C-alpha cells in the first residue's frame, strides 16, 4: 500500500480490488479443540435387515444413506488387525501395545438421531462379503462426471466378480446419479476414510481389496504436495535442493504454506491424508487451488524433464504464466544439461580422475552442477533472457507430444515452445 497520484491534476487515487478470504484450515488445528472425531450412525436396526434394506434399495432408485452407513458399520465392525508397532496420530493413541485394532477404533461412535425403507429376505451372509466393497467403490465411481472414466464401475463390478462369480451391479443405469449424493454425507466419508486409513496400515489383509474405491480418499484435495513429490522424483534432487530452485514469490509463499511444521505430512500412517473426508479441514492447504503457481511451475518443469503425468495436468487460472514458465525453463534446462554422470563402481580400484590442466579458459559455458547460485549468475550473463539453446531444448521436449487435452499444461507447453 503506497500512495498513487494522477499526474495531470495531482489527484490522489486508491486502486483497490474486491477481497476474498478463502482461509486455510490445517489438520492439527482441529485436534487442539477436539481430541477425537465422531461418526454419527444409527444402531437400531439389525444387520440382516439392513442387508435387504440396501440391496432392495440399491435395485431401485431409492436408498437411504443412513441405511448404507448403519449397514456398513455392522458389515465392517468385526474386521481387525494386529499392530506390530504402536500407532498414534495428533495426540490420539489409537493402538496400545500388541492389542488388535478394528476399523472403527480410529473414530468414536455416536448415535444418529428413522428412514422407513423397505426390507428383503433370502439375502444371506454371502452378500455381507461384497456389499461393503460395492458401496465403497461407488464413492470413487461417483466423483467423476466423465462418461468413460466413470466406467470404473466395471472394475468394481470386476473386483466383486472376483469375490462371487455371479455378481452383477444391483443398480439401474440412472444409478449414475444415485451414489453421487453419498459423497455429501459426512459420516459416509468418515467411513471411507477410516477404511482406507485402516487398510493402509494392515496392507495384506484378506479384505484389503476393500481399499478399492476408498484409495481416492488418501490425499484428496492435496495435489500440489504430490506435484512436489513428483518434482523431487523427476529432478532426482533432494527436497531441500528443489526448494532452493523456487524463483517466484508466489511459489515461495505457497511452499511456505504447505510446509507448516506440525501437520504430520511426513508420517507414514497418519490422519493427515484424510483431512477432508474426516472433516479435519474444510479448505485443504495442499490443494492446487490454494497452491496454483506451485502446481503449474512444478508440473511444467517435470513435463520439460520428460514427465508423463504432467502431459494431462491442468493449467490453473489467474497466475503469472510468463515468470513461472521462465523459471521452469531455467530449472528444467539446468537439470537437463547437468546430467552429473559420475562413476559408481570400480574394478581394479581405478576411478575417473578429472584433469585440471585445462586452462584455455572455456568460459561463457553453463555451470557444471545444479546450484541455483551459479545458474542465476549464468542467466544474468544471458541478460535474463532464455538463450536459443534453452528454447530449442524446450521445443525438443514438447514436440512429438500427441493426444493433448485442452486446458492442460501439456498443450500449454506444446503451444508455447513448439514453433
Amino acid at each position: 500500500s503506497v500512495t498513487v497520484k494522477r499526474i495531470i491534476d495531482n489527484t490522489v487515487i486508491v486502486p483497490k480490488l474486491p477481497a476474498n478470504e478463502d482461509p486455510v484450515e490445517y489438520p492439527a488445528d482441529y485436534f487442539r479443540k477436539s481430541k477425537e472425531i465422531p461418526l454419527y450412525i444409527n444402531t437400531t436396526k439389525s444387520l440382516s435387515d439392513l442387508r435387504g434394506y440396501v440391496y432392495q434399495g440399491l435395485k431401485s432408485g431409492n436408498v437411504s444413506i443412513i441405511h448404507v452407513n448403519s449397514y456398513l458399520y455392522g458389515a465392517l465392525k468385526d474386521i481387525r488387525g494386529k499392530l506390530d508397532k504402536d500407532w498414534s496420530s495428533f495426540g490420539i493413541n489409537i493402538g496400545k501395545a500388541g492389542d488388535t485394532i478394528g476399523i472403527f477404533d480410529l473414530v468414536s461412535l455416536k448415535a444418529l438421531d428413522l428412514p422407513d425403507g423397505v426390507s428383503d429376505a433370502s439375502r444371506t451372509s454371502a452378500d455381507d462379503k461384497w456389499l461393503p466393497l460395492y458401496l465403497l467403490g461407488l464413492y470413487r465411481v461417483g466423483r467423476t462426471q466423465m462418461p468413460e472414466y466413470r466406467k470404473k464401475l466395471m472394475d468394481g463390478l470386476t473386483n466383486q466378480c472376483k469375490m462371487i462369480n455371479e455378481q452383477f451391479e444391483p443398480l439401474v443405469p440412472e444409478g449414475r446419479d444415485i451414489f453421487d449424493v453419498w459423497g455429501n454425507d459426512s459420516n459416509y466419508t468418515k467411513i471411507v476414510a477410516a477404511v482406507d486409513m485402516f487398510f493402509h496400515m494392515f496392507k495384506k489383509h484378506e479384505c484389503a481389496s476393500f481399499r478399492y474405491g476408498t484409495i481416492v480418499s488418501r490425499f484428496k484435495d492435496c495435489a500440489a504436495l504430490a506435484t512436489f513429490g513428483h518434482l523431487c522424483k523427476i529432478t532426482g534432487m533432494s527436497t531441500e535442493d528443489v526448494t532452493t530452485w523456487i524463483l517466484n514469490r508466489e511459489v515461495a509463499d505457497e511452499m511456505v504454506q504447505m510446509m507448516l511444521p506440525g501437520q504430520e505430512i511426513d508420517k507414514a500412517d497418519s490422519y493427515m491424508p484424510y483431512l477432508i473426508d474426516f472433516g479435519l479441514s474444510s479448505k485443504s492447504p495442499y490443494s492446487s487451488v490454494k497452491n496454483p503457481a506451485f502446481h503449474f511451475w512444478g508440473q511444467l518443469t517435470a513435463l520439460l524433464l520428460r514427465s508423463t503425468r504432467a502431459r494431462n495436468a491442468r493449467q490453473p487460472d489467474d497466475i503469472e504464466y510468463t515468470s513461472l514458465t521462465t523459471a521452469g525453463l531455467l530449472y528444467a534446462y539446468a537439470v537437463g544439461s547437468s546430467a552429473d554422470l559420475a562413476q559408481q563402481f570400480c574394478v581394479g580400484d581405478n576411478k575417473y580422475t578429472p584433469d585440471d590442466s585445462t586452462g584455455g579458459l572455456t568460459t561463457n559455458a553453463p555451470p557444471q552442477g545444479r546450484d541455483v547460485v551459479e545458474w542465476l549468475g549464468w542467466f544474468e550473463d544471458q541478460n535474463r533472457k532464455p538463450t536459443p539453446d534453452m528454447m530449442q531444448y524446450a521445443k525438443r521436449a514438447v514436440m512429438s507430444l500427441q493426444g493433448l487435452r485442452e486446458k492442460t499444461i501439456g498443450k500449454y507447453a506444446k503451444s508455447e515452445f513448439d514453433k
Partner: nanobody, 122 residues
Framework: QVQLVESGGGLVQAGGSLTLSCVAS????????LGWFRQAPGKEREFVAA????????NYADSVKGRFTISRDDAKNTVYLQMNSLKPEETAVYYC?????????????????WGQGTQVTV
C-alpha cells in the same frame, strides 16, 4: 472383550432415590451399546433402560418412565442411572449390559456383554 462391573446397589426406603453405576474394563475405545436390565424373584430378565454410544439416544421401560434416568461418561467409561421414587416392585437384581454397535436395543438378545449384577431391595 469387555468387562462390566455394577456398583451402587443396596437397600433403600420405600419412596427413596438411588443411583447405580457400571464401570467398563478392557476395550472402551469402540462402539458399544449400554443398557440396564433387571430380574425379580421368579421373574424373567426384563429391560429397564438403554443409551446409545454418543449419549443422545435413550429409552426406558414403561414401568420406570419419569423416575429413572440414564447417562454415560465414556471418558471415564461408565454409565450412571438415577432411580428416584423407588417401589418394592422395583426390587430385583440389576444388570449392566453392552452390545457393540451404535444404538440401544430394547431386548436382552441384542446385548453381548453382561455384568454380574447388583441386588436392589426396596
Amino acid at each position: 472383550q469387555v468387562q462390566l462391573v455394577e456398583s451402587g446397589g443396596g437397600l433403600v426406603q420405600a419412596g427413596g432415590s438411588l443411583t447405580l453405576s457400571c464401570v467398563a474394563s478392557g476395550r472402551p475405545f469402540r462402539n458399544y451399546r449400554l443398557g440396564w436390565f433387571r430380574q425379580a424373584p421368579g421373574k424373567e430378565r426384563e429391560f429397564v433402560a438403554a443409551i446409545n454410544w454418543g449419549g443422545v439416544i435413550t429409552n426406558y421401560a414403561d414401568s420406570v418412565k419419569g423416575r429413572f434416568t440414564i447417562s454415560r461418561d465414556d471418558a471415564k467409561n461408565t454409565v450412571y442411572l438415577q432411580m428416584n421414587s423407588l417401589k418394592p416392585e422395583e426390587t430385583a437384581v440389576y444388570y449392566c449390559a453392552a452390545f457393540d454397535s451404535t444404538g440401544s436395543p430394547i431386548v436382552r438378545d441384542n446385548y453381548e456383554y453382561w455384568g454380574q449384577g447388583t441386588q436392589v431391595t426396596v
